[PDB]
Design a protein around this ligand. Structure first.
Ligand SMILES: *[C@@H]1O[C@H](CO[C@@H]2O[C@@H](C)[C@@H](O)[C@@H](O)[C@@H]2O)[C@@H](O[C@@H]2O[C@H](CO)[C@@H](O[C@@H]3O[C@H](CO[C@H]4O[C@H](CO)[C@@H](O)[C@H](O)[C@@H]4O[C@@H]4O[C@H](CO)[C@@H](O[C@@H]5O[C@H](CO)[C@H](O)[C@H](O)[C@H]5O)[C@H](O)[C@H]4NC(C)=O)[C@@H](O)[C@H](O[C@H]4O[C@H](CO)[C@@H](O)[C@H](O)[C@@H]4O)[C@@H]3O)[C@H](O)[C@H]2NC(C)=O)[C@H](O)[C@H]1NC(C)=O
Ligand SMILES: *[C@@H]1O[C@H](CO[C@@H]2O[C@@H](C)[C@@H](O)[C@@H](O)[C@@H]2O)[C@@H](O[C@@H]2O[C@H](CO)[C@@H](O[C@@H]3O[C@H](CO[C@H]4O[C@H](CO)[C@@H](O)[C@H](O)[C@@H]4O[C@@H]4O[C@H](CO)[C@@H](O[C@@H]5O[C@H](CO)[C@H](O)[C@H](O)[C@H]5O)[C@H](O)[C@H]4NC(C)=O)[C@@H](O)[C@H](O[C@H]4O[C@H](CO)[C@@H](O)[C@H](O)[C@@H]4O)[C@@H]3O)[C@H](O)[C@H]2NC(C)=O)[C@H](O)[C@H]1NC(C)=O
Lengths: 207, 13, 208
């Protein structure tokens, strides 16, 4: 039989009132002999009719990938409403149902602490600049770096770990050339999370 | 030399 | 039918000369009618025999769980030797084979750097002391915290992240009550990894 996967919107999409955040019902292993798929969406048990079906795609392994996308209001998902996709198809005993939402539980405001490079490192070509993000719930977040109104893109960020107070924490690490750092430059850490003032905050760092 | 970890021997080269 | 799962030694065991590293070849979904198994273990194509069968566990979903452990030398493993388990059972038209080994790739010394809390964390009740390990290959590592010869257990560590030079990096963080950080106390960050002198380095952190 065919299989279903329901994904959340990207965190950034929910936290910027500029973008359009969307939920995605994904159906793989759809047969050639019967590829027709009824979707029904409900937002808290209440049916809705404005989901939109993506172009059918042949995966080249006797199966189709069939997608249905549903647009959500920022507040709607933020206030943890429950989104549900019932999938139906002749080659399936009963319809399959799945649900998702925001991770339940009190939201907590993240603390953002920038950490400068250790003197021991100062003998190298490049230096590591750190952004400590702890104390946030839930774990949905986005992290960026910038300098002089310019996006610096040479950073990696850890996935959130579960801390022992029930919260989450992670680290972003921007690597730059020693020279640049010595020359007194300002590098910034951008954090977007529901529990911040205006779902956005920014720390910065310099010698 | 030798390295010890919590007073448990780690390694000697 | 039966299924095979082959797990590597703990990073610690391969690194502490005084520990005993071992591969573990687990066999799940094993039937009552033919519970019997044969294990043949091979090191770099060549057979070995000092295998051992840990006692048979009944699974309570009607299957048995039979497991084979092979002891292995520290240096064999760390030199990237390959360990193959082969499993044969009456309910299995062909024997199953599985190989493991240390991830292939030139080894790289980790750079370890400790990091005091932000002038900004200082207000809050509890503070975060950070250990950064960067520039290491391969990803098999252990990080431990301590003070005055004694293990501190309120730390947490990130899974190793792949860097853009092909090495790995992680951050380990420990939370202490503020006053303790104030009280002149000295904390240590212990890193065990192969490309290190004696597979061990340690780094301290304190107020100034
Ligand atoms: C034929 O092949 C197909 C396709 O496979 C591909 O092509 C073939 C030819 C091969 O080359 C493969 O290597 C290719 O993958 C097979 O389809 C696969 O089936 C799998 C199971 O049958 C299924 O596995 C499940 O995947 C989950 C994760 O899915 C992620 O990530 C994977 C890989 O990381 C990726 O393949 C998926 O597409 C998906 O990626 C996410 O997409 C969503 C929605 O598109 C994104 O969210 C949206 O993003 C948009 C932006 O466009 C927007 O912002 C929206 O707001 C937002 O909603 C999201 O960002 C993407 N994330 C990432 C990281 O990329 C697993 O988690 C899951 O496991 C879980 O479930 C189980 C519980 O029951 C547990 O086992 C498990 O622990 C987990 O809990 C599954 O493993 C594959 O996803 C699927 N591949 C694809 C491409 O769909 C097919 O089965 C095969 N048929 C046959 C007969 O052989
Ligand atoms: C009847 O039940 C059994 C038993 O299962 C348990 O009870 C049932 C009822 C459920 O409650 C389960 O939740 C319980 O596990 C079923 O057996 C299960 O079969 C699964 C497949 O059929 C199999 O899946 C694989 O899991 C791998 C991870 O294994 C880990 O982690 C799980 C939980 O996360 C844990 O329960 C396992 O015991 C195992 O733990 C590891 O043990 C190793 C080796 O012993 C440890 O390493 C050694 O440690 C010793 C000392 O302890 C020493 O230090 C040595 O140096 C060292 O070698 C190690 O610490 C533990 N490892 C980890 C990681 O924690 C997955 O990795 C694997 O993924 C692979 O395959 C997947 C798809 O097949 C892919 O997604 C992926 O790409 C991988 O290729 C498997 O999915 C379960 O492990 C197995 N559970 C157990 C306990 O054996 C059985 O199926 C069922 N029967 C029927 C008919 O349904």
């Amino acid at each position: 039989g065919p299989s279903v996967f329901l994904f959340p919107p990207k965190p950034k999409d929910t936290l910027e009132a500029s973008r359009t955040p969307e939920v995605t019902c994904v159906v793989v292993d759809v047969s050639h002999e019967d590829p027709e798929v009824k979707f029904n969406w409900y937002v808290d048990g209440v049916e809705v009719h404005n989901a939109k079906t993506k172009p059918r795609e042949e995966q080249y392994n006797s199966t189709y990938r069939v997608v249905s996308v549903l647009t959500v209001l920022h507040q709607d998902w933020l206030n943890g409403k429950e989104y549900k996709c019932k999938v139906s198809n002749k080659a399936l005993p009963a319809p399959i149902e799945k649900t998702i939402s925001k991770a339940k539980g009190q939201p907590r405001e993240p603390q953002v602490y920038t950490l400068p490079p250790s003197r021991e490192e100062m003998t190298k070509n490049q230096v590591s600049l750190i952004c400590l993000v702890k104390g946030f719930y839930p774990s949905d977040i986005a992290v960026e770096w910038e300098s002089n109104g310019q996006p610096e893109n040479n950073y990696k960020t850890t996935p959130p770990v579960l801390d022992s107070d029930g919260s989450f924490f992670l680290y972003s690490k921007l690597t730059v050339d020693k020279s640049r750092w010595q020359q007194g430059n300002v590098f910034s850490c951008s954090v977007m999370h529901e529990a911040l003032h205006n779902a956005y905050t920014q720390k910065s760092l310099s010698l | 030399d030798c390295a010890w970890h919590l007073g448990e021997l780690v390694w000697c080269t």
